[PDB]
Design a protein around this ligand. Structure first.
Ligand SMILES: [Mn+2]
Ligand SMILES: [Mn+2]
Ligand SMILES: [Mn+2]
Ligand SMILES: [Mn+2]
Lengths: 310, 310
């Protein structure tokens, strides 16, 4: 049976790029019978990436067992609630990630390669180099895009020196001008006007279990926070519906200005006091400004984890 | 600040060797201010290893915070209950291990290098090579000893092809004949007659939390199982005391004949039905013979994990 390689639910560019690239690396370098798949359709930014390099989106699955798989390799995630529905029924052969670890356990030893760098694609690319496996233009393009996507063109505080070193290498392999391509790709993911309120709050959203509470943290990239706030009423309605249908304790939406590097936080839930403590602010009409925030893994999750536990 | 590098409670040769070696690697490759420390004194096997290569036992600590450390690097373990007492109060900067993952979580991203190989020392050695950092005779000796210890001289089912590949290389760097040295160090850890019953059951023992139950799994290396069983009365008394003192639901002792690769399982607790299901045998007078069993991580933990969750 093939070993399925995939990123998290609501995959982003890095999730798609890292799983596609690692599935290939695992075949060439480790002789594993892998297959890259996805848990969701590409969102707009990734659609731009796939079209630019001429790569088909990995097929979407809903059950690892239904595919006949016995083993899986996770990229860009490790928390079970962010993975395939029946993740508990298959063996986790390996994990390549750059996120915090939680709600993850195995009965047996496994392979894990985690680094606190800008993207999982960055880790995968460096693994290509260490194993002397040639990187095609298409794979370079997808990995480069994952890196650019997750670090907002190397300016996010999650950007590691090693990310800055490999970006130009990947751009060369991908046949693109790093800044020219990067800016175009990032802009492709800021067209929120084409999305309904219910769609926008689930484009890039993950669930975190904080002290027994299921907290949904969503993020959207924009070039104008004010414009998004003009739709506050409809967004709040969508959020309330999401909370009711999924049983979340709280919903935190990051409206991220990727040009100026700040996020307006729109939150609704039963633990707003914990949200305010985490962000050192006071919500007014369900929102407040979080200066300098662009990263969920570095500027939202650690803080919420701490506030919910104390 | 000082980053402490250490193995699990009741450290064995691999725990001591891998942490000693990794602390050096981290300092040499990145200039990190690391310090290898231990959570306990070396067992008799490791004492032989340390004296053989002229290395002092890493100093023992009881609290990471008491040492002024804000960050730690764990080797040979990841489960919090097997780590430093205040592991939840410090940041886990990195982990190098070859065990299953459980009871481990972080608020922030981190470094993790896990591989299902024979020892953590094996992983550390290959990391030295990946970083182009030369290995001294003493560090080679400690890492080789960790590998020999955890795989019983490369004959345990946990032995990986990569372990067999690096063994001769490490032996040459350590200046020893692999078989001659291996037999000598392994023998040094089989003197059980001189240990009290209370000492014996805690030489090499780890706690696993299975479905809310704290199960203690200890192991001792011997050349004569029957000889150890002559002391069953006092050993059981020590086990009952340990169960009472620590609130364990069950205690499993592996009496391992390292010459013939078999283990007698002596178990006492509230879930013997789950223990019998895990090993597919019947306990008589609290014990049963398990042919071919020598590995806790491969032949005990996965099986108990499954039976306790059934
Ligand atoms: Mn992602
Ligand atoms: Mn990512
Ligand atoms: Mn160990
Ligand atoms: Mn080990």
């Amino acid at each position: 049976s093939k070993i399925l390689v995939f990123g998290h639910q609501n995959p982003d560019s890095d999730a798609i790029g890292s799983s596609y690239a690692f599935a290939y690396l695992a075949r060439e370098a480790y002789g594993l019978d892998t297959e890259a798949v996805a848990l969701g359709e590409p969102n707009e930014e990734t659609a731009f990436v796939l079209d630019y390099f001429g790569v088909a989106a990995p097929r979407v699955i809903t059950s690892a067992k239904a595919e006949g798989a016995e083993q899986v390799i996770l990229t860009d995630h490790n928390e079970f609630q962010q993975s395939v529905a029946d993740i508990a029924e298959v063996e986790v052969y390996g994990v390549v990630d750059h996120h915090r670890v939680a709600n993850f356990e195995t009965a047996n030893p496994l392979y894990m390669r985690l680094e606190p760098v800008g993207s999982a694609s960055s880790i995968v690319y460096r693994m290509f180099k260490e194993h002397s496996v040639a990187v095609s233009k298409e794979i370079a393009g997808l990995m480069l895009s994952g890196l650019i996507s997750d670090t907002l063109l190397l300016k996010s505080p999650t950007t590691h020196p090693t990310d800055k070193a490999i970006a130009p290498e990947l751009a060369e392999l991908a046949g693109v001008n790093l800044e020219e391509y990067g800016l175009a790709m990032l802009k492709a993911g800021t067209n929120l006007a084409s999305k309904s309120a219910e769609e926008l709050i689930d484009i890039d959203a993950k669930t975190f279990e904080l002290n027994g509470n299921n907290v949904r943290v969503a993020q959207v990239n924009t070039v104008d926070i004010a414009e998004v706030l003009e739709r506050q009423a409809e967004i709040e309605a969508a959020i309330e519906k999401a909370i009711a249908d999924n049983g979340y304790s709280d919903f935190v939406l990051m409206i991220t200005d990727i040009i100026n590097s700040n996020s307006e936080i729109l939150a609704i839930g039963s633990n707003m006091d914990k949200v305010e403590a985490a962000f050192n602010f006071v919500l007014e009409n369900n929102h407040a400004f979080l200066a300098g925030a662009v990263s969920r893994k570095k500027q939202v999750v650690p803080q919420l984890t701490e506030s919910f536990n104390a």
